[model samples]
Target: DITVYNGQHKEAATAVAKAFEQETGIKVTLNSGKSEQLAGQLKEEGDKTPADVFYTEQTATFADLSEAGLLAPISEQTIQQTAQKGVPLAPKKDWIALSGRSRVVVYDHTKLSEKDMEKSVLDYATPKWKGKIGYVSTSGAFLEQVVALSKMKGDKVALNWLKGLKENGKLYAKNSVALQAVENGEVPAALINNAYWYNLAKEKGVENLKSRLYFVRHQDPGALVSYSGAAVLKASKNQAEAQKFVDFLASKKGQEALVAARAEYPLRADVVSPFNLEPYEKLEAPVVSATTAQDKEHAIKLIEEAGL
Candidate 1:
């Protein structure tokens, strides 16, 4: 039996695990937790770790493990198997990204038309948008977007964006609350990952939905398409089995399983997205970040300095 430490949704991971077992006849043991929690455990355990394959929902988790010498380079065939390998944050081609987390603007169609919205995320900080936007203050994706901007535009620009967002936008307790605010016309738009919109639409039913999703095209920090990453542990006794699992993750079947489980954008080109969302290729999200405490470190301070 192969073991996996999954920092993604438990059911989704479980579904993928079962599918792997069914296809390969490999019994799998899966452990689910937040990325930070699993990262801590993996680092502390060192080479004595039992995990064969590691699935990460956050880039930092994969970074920590790779830095601690926990992950092995994914096979070249597997690397080539992914639809697109993009991560300016944690550019370790070793931990291949298997799925996408799209940064988006969830808007109330009742309040604003697509043409009325700002072309860039920066415009929200302007006088015209004071107190008219919403975002989840606790979102890591938000911090990642800030780090991405800092890399592309400079620290000053990212901090300015954060300050503008904080000053002009409502800080919601969670992404759902932010989306709900938009749906109820509490704000013209909300900053979030696409999953929350898909989840809410699933939760509230499509017929009752009032909001529409919009992606910020052209590699804007506003259009970050970060990955839910996965890697194989160097300590595994089952390297072949582990690679099979990791390879399968980047394969069409595995991506399809994830698409069904999370409604996320699949990283494989061949897999058709079931959610009817816009094409990811058309989204033009920035190179996903290469994350660490350095960029994200100052980001939290900036966010807090803005009184978020």
Candidate 2:
């Protein structure tokens, strides 16, 4: 039996846990919450924590746990499974990636075509895109992009980019609001995770949408990709069982289970979204690692400085 502190999508996590339990007969217990709050609880609880595995939607949370030495390294056998499939993993190999998400420009097709869209996310920061773009001010994925930009180009350039965005792009409370802005023609496009559009399209059926997704390839920071990862806690008494849960999540069977339940991309190369999303291999995400993308504090500070 193992206890899971799941910060990933609740239904998706439960689906994976059920699949794991049915196969191995290990009793699975889940405590679900937002990633940041769960991470804070783990740090506060320390070794006395009952959690055997920590699963979350954002890589930064796993990076935070790994940095604080709260996570145990996954077994080489389990790590090799993801490696063989070309799935990205934590640089330290302490956490196993279960799924991926890419940043994209969701655009109102009538207003902007692929040819008319800006070449890079940085372009939206310029005067040309003034009042033409929308973005969520408090989104984790958006902040992840800022962190990637800061790492790739340095603080000054990243700050300038954020300032430009503040001046040019309209701020929204969340991705849904930004997407709504695009749909209503308040803006031609918006910066958001690809899953936001996919989930909506799934709910309303794709043909009903007046918008389309533009994947900004070529290793642009705008195309920055991130993962949802799970790690075995260093304090776990159920060490082997915990490792098995991490192993199952990276397996083909596990990927299938998760993809069936969620809108995000499955980490396995063999598994694809049933929703007919653009394949993961087609995405030209930048080369930012989980650890390098972990500096949320710096990104937050820059976001504040830019008044975003």
Candidate 3:
């Protein structure tokens, strides 16, 4: 028996869990909730947690567990085989990225041209974009992107951009709401994840979709790639099974399922992701060391400063 605690994207999570159970004949239990609330509960439950595995959409939450010393170290061989790179050292090798999403600007075609948008996220702070941008405040995923930007651009630039966005940009409580605002010309543009716009268009039809994605600087801080991570709890009674599940998720079959179900980009370089994602090699995202890059303290500070 395996108990899975998932944060965000409940429908997708349940779909994957059902498939895994069918294939392995292992009983699987699924729990879903807001990421922050789940993280708090995991912390409170400690070793007594019924959760054998912890899965989350944001890298920071996984970082939190690793920082708290509540995660078991994953196999190095498995890490090397599954990901293009190794897991961050700070997370105590407790978790590995399963999938990732890139940060992007979604704009109304009538309001902005591909060339009119800034090449990097930092450009959003400029006076030219004043009163033009929009985003959702309730999205922790967006907050994580801001956190990545602050690390690369320093407090002043990051803070200035956030202030500008707050003053000039329209705000909403959800990505779909923000997307609709941009589509309807309620706002000229929005900061969004690459997949959200694409998924919506695919599900809602392109004719109804009103926004296009603009990739920020190909580098690290410019177009942030937030990861969905997986880890086995230190208290899990079924460590082997938990690890096995993680391994399967990182495997070709698991990656295929995720891509098919949610359009998530695979971490493996060898596997061809189903989504029409830009080649990872071409991106110019910042070169922050992975350990420092995944730091929760730095992430939280930026989020707090941004009033996210």
Best by lDDT: 2
- TM-scores of the models, in the given order? 0.93, 0.91, 0.84
RMSD of each: 2.0, 2.3, 3.4
Tens-place lDDT digits, model 3, residues 168-269: 677788887888889898888888777778788777776776678887664746566666777899988899889888787777777767777776667767
Write the residue-wise lDDT of candidate 2 on 255-285 in tens digits. 8898878888776778878767776667877
Candidate lDDT scores, in order, read 0.79, 0.84, 0.72
**Ranking of predictions according to lDDT:** 2, 1, 3
TM-score rank, highest first? 1, 2, 3
> What C-alpha lDDT, on a 0 to 100 scale, does residue 214 get in candidate 2?
92
Q: What is the Cα root-mean-square deviation between model 3 and the actual structure? A: 3.4
Instruction: Supply candidate 3's per-residue lDDT for 166.
Output: 70
User: Model 3 — which ten-residue stretch has the worst lDDT?
Assistant: 82-91
Span of ten consecutive residues with least summed lDDT in model 1: 83-92
lDDT of 1 by residue, 1-308 (tens): 79999888887798789889888999989888877888888888878889888888765567767777788887777777664635333355668877777888888887888887777877777678788888787888888877777788887887788888767888898888898888777888888889888877776787798898877787677888777768888888789999899888888888888787787877677887766656567778776446776767887887777777
Clashes of each: 7, 0, 9
